[PDB]
Amino acid sequence: MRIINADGLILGRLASRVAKMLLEGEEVVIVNAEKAVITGNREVIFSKYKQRTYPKRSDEIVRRTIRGMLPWKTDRGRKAFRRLKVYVGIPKEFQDKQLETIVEAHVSRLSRPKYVTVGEVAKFLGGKF
Template identity: 25%
Template sequence: MVSGSGICAKRVVVDARHHMLGRLASILAKELLNGQKVVVVRCEEICLSGGLVRQKMKYLRFLRKRMNTKPSHGPIHFRAPAKILWRTIRGSVVNLVYLCVSAYVSLFVCLLERCPVADYVDILLERYPVADYVGIDGMIPHKTKRGAAALARLKVYEGVPPPYDKMKRMVIPDALKVLRLQAGHKYCLLGKLSSEVGWNHYETIKELEVKRKERAQVAYERKKQLTKLRLKAEKAAEEKLGPQLEIIAPIKY
């Protein structure tokens, strides 16, 4: 999307349909840090590897992470697909700090009880699975001015709201499910997962998408007719011009 110069004022609209969540987020994060403005639409059709039941259980484990004394301080558990993508790009450092503190506490307990180091490692992995902490550093340093400016360049939506429904939409081949996920591997849609864990607008978005596609089909048929009439008019003009075409050919008529 951008050459790496960090200078690009054009806004790129990305159609997130059938893109892998992690791969899409990492590529978008890099482009945002390089200065690219990005709009992501159809976030409800982003794919996650693994079946729906597996992903739902993983999200329910995430819901249990809260601040004991004041849960409103975080972590915030977003349900909407667009906000889940946004949080994936932004990331969080809270869990990493928690993991480090927990590791030191577990090591101190093992030393007091004179447990072998191997037992300490087993206890640590049992209490704090590594899979729950992969990528928790985040993809954007959002607490710095540079990271905050990068996040400000990002817009995420469910469906395709105006005016982006009339703009050219791009895909990211490096993140497409059909190119990156093994054939036959289980996957689920982010919108379906969100509807299972508390997002209540999945059906509404699907209805709006049906209406948008109907409008787009009408516009496409009209465009085809206009193109056909234009070609017919150009052919008629060429027949009338006849030998004069050779005269105006040097000016690339």
């Protein structure tokens, strides 16, 4: 399996790359889901997700975003989605494992980064975490 640390990764980019991994047969675990980021204006992002509510918890938001990038309705999409596990923080079983990142998804690769974390969106919506 491949364990990805979502800390500082742009949600959309993270989701697109992970969807491809799942379709290619890889088992993917995402940790620190609440630390992934969404670029844009804070009020606009909050409003957008407020209208969608749809999961309100960080891990669920990340899971749903990835589901939308897969051929969900098909048999190939369902099988791929089954190989995904998402968690907030880093559960005990993954604390001493190698955590990978996705360089292309780093928000730090942006010149003028404006963003909020998934956790901040979850808190705003009333999610547990």
